[PDB]
């Protein structure tokens, strides 16, 4: 419905390290500047009527640390938080804290923010495939009954609007095993801007490219 | 060191319009461009070239094309493969494809993969069905299914991984061409219309990969 026409933007955040190196600073400084850039992106997306924003840090501690304080801020901004990726092996305490963060913001009506954690597009497809395999095994599913629509219902974020636009900052032109199944029809937008420097005008530029290309 | 290039060929219609000609003229020009790209890939050591024409007469034209060009590809040591769901094409066309693939299957020069009614999601689904058959047979447990295994059941698993995807025509989308296969490929988008895409354009894409 929004003027730019897209409902779900996914971003491959790259450039944090190079940004810090340009400044003569260690990588942790760029990762912090990157976290600030994430907050700015989240506010921009919400203020621009985007339904969902999915972020992939292209490459655990910061994640672990930032969880509590960051989640409280997202909650106060009416953002619904969801973690996508393979957390099945994360220790039980972390898995519980993640669940608590999702549970807390589950009823929020603002932006739905998906954060990739140990995520891979091929893994995503495989986990869905294993779910269908189980049905087949139980005798409840004929292999010929498996079609794209069914597999689609088992890949991450199938309940949200399809990803409309994928932005990759940092200058590389590859998906790097982020979303695969989900980006079959998405506009792909590449910018040389390093993630910490990616701001509202840069995001507006990607949305405008989408609008003019759609 | 780019071993497998995939191309979404788009721009034939727009090209013909700009030249003040009918769609057919653009397609004829587009076909010459295919000939040129195939030669460039073979001449520059590219191991595999996968072509997707972005969109009963068409089918018959495919039969005709196969009948007239396969022998030459065969003499050039090119292996021809059609990727996509050809299951519902007419029986005669399915047989012509099978015979052309069979004839050139052992060739070791360039492998040329031509998409025909292909979709990246369909490709993944067909591999999933194969694994499903094995599960319903008892020869495979759902939790034995991993990336490596699914990878062995999607199109072109026997070839070098796709290293570079080029899309001509100006659009910046994959449009359900390869998905599983391009997880790590360089994506190169050019506004150049397919009929105009030449060796300089192709080299430009290879340079993007090289960088």
UniProtKB/Swiss-Prot annotation, chain A:
Q: What does this protein do?
A: Generates ditrans,octacis-undecaprenyl pyrophosphate (UPP) from isopentenyl pyrophosphate (IPP) and farnesyl diphosphate (FPP). UPP is the precursor of glycosyl carrier lipid in the biosynthesis of bacterial cell wall polysaccharide components such as peptidoglycan and lipopolysaccharide.
**How is the enzymatic or functional activity of this protein modulated?**
Inhibited by bisphosphonates.
What does the sequence similarity comment in the record state about its family? Belongs to the UPP synthase family.
Give, from the UniProt record, the effect of changing residue 79 to A: Formation predominantly of C(60), C(65) and C(70) polymers rather than the C(55) polymer
Summarizing the annotation, the consequence of altering residue 192 to A is: Slight decrease in activity
Q: What is the effect of changing residue 195 to F?
A: Decrease in affinity for IPP
- Annotated NCBIfam families: PRK10240.1 (NF007596), PRK14830.1 (NF011405), uppS (TIGR00055)
What is this organism's lineage?
Bacteria, Pseudomonadati, Pseudomonadota, Gammaproteobacteria, Enterobacterales
User: What is the protein name for this chain?
Assistant: Ditrans,polycis-undecaprenyl-diphosphate synthase ((2E,6E)-farnesyl-diphosphate specific)
Q: Which cofactor does it need?
A: Mg(2+)
**Assigned keywords, A-Z:** Cell cycle, Cell division, Cell shape, Cell wall biogenesis/degradation, Magnesium, Metal-binding, Peptidoglycan synthesis, Transferase
One matching Pfam family, short form?
Answer: Prenyltransf
- Effect upon mutating residue 111 to A: Formation predominantly of a C(70) polymer rather than the C(55) polymer
């Amino acid at each position: 419905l929004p003027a730019h026409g897209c409902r779900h933007v996914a971003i491959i955040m790259d450039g944090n390290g190079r940004w810090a190196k340009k400044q003569g600073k260690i990588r942790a400084f760029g990762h912090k500047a990157g976290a600030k850039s994430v907050r700015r992106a989240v506010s921009f997306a919400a203020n621009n009527g985007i339904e969902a924003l999915t972020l992939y840090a292209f490459s655990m501690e910061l994640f672990v640390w930032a969880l509590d304080s960051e989640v409280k801020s997202l909650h106060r901004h009416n953002v619904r938080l969801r973690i996508i990726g393979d957390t099945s092996r994360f220790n039980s305490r972390l898995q519980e804290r993640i669940r608590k963060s999702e549970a807390l913001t589950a009823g929020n009506t603002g932006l739905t923010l998906n954060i990739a954690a140990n995520y891979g597009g091929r893994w995503d497809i495989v986990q869905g495939v294993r779910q269908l395999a189980e049905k087949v095994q139980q005798g409840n599913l004929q292999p010929d009954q498996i079609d794209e629509e069914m597999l689609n219902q088992h890949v991450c974020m199938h309940e949200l609007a399809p990803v409309d636009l994928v932005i990759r900052t940092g200058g590389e032109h590859r998906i790097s095993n982020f979303l695969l199944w989900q980006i079959a029809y998405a506009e792909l937008y590449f910018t040389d801007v390093l993630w910490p420097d990616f701001d509202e005008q840069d995001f507006e530029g990607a949305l405008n490219a989408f609008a003019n290309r759609e």
